[PDB]
Write a protein that binds this ligand. Sequence first.
Ligand SMILES: Cc1ncc([N+](=O)[O-])n1CCOS(N)(=O)=O
Ligand SMILES: [Zn+2]
Length: 256
Amino acid sequence: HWGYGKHNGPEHWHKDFPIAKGERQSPVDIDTHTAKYDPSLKPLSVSYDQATSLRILNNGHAFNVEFDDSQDKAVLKGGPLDGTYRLIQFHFHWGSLDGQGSEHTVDKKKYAAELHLVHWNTKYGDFGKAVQQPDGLAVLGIFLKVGSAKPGLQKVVDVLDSIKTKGKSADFTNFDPRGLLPESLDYWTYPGSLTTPPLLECVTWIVLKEPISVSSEQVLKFRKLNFNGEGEPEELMVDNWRPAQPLKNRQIKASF
Ligand SMILES: Cc1ncc([N+](=O)[O-])n1CCOS(N)(=O)=O
Ligand SMILES: [Zn+2]
């Protein structure tokens, strides 16, 4: 039932998912002057050399590029994490205009979009069990700004024509997620939640300071996708982002 419309959007989610007003909800505004440098944080370790993508799916809210996570092939570790987290999928949140689209904000600044690389803690055996744990997931967030094109993102942009509407999927093998990373791995980290229902509070958020640049043409294609299924009135898939939530009793730590 939930969505991003006027009648089923973020302000309505708490009715079906009370945890929406919880103590560690995401996203949040990252106040750069209040985040504290934590010299103890370890460098982040992103090992995607063996990543195996499989498919791309329009699920009615976003498009997901899914990976084979049946073996340790693409893992995130280090940083604030204890253990190894395996990549399961990545997706984006974007706006109807370049002035908005990201979920996290930096000193209230909204970026044109935000990429989320979702990983689950291998100590829990699988994704379904991991989401029921406070340290079950690690999501790496990367901001997108509009400027020069991101060569590594083009294969994704080009396949979107084939999954225009809800429920459509397409084979999507050999896509290298390393092509979506900025140069620097400096980051902010805080304990949070999934940003869409069920809004489970099982995420260690790791948000990179350096955004990647994508072209106006690339983000324009994102905006041609549909929230609706085929044969239904067209509603463009835009502004599929949840606004910043109360930080409450949390400190955002910086790796730099
Ligand atoms: C609800 C849910 N379960 C798993 C995923 N996922 O992997 O994208 N999501 C979507 C929301 O994920 S997110 N925005 O919190 O990174
Ligand atoms: Zn997301």
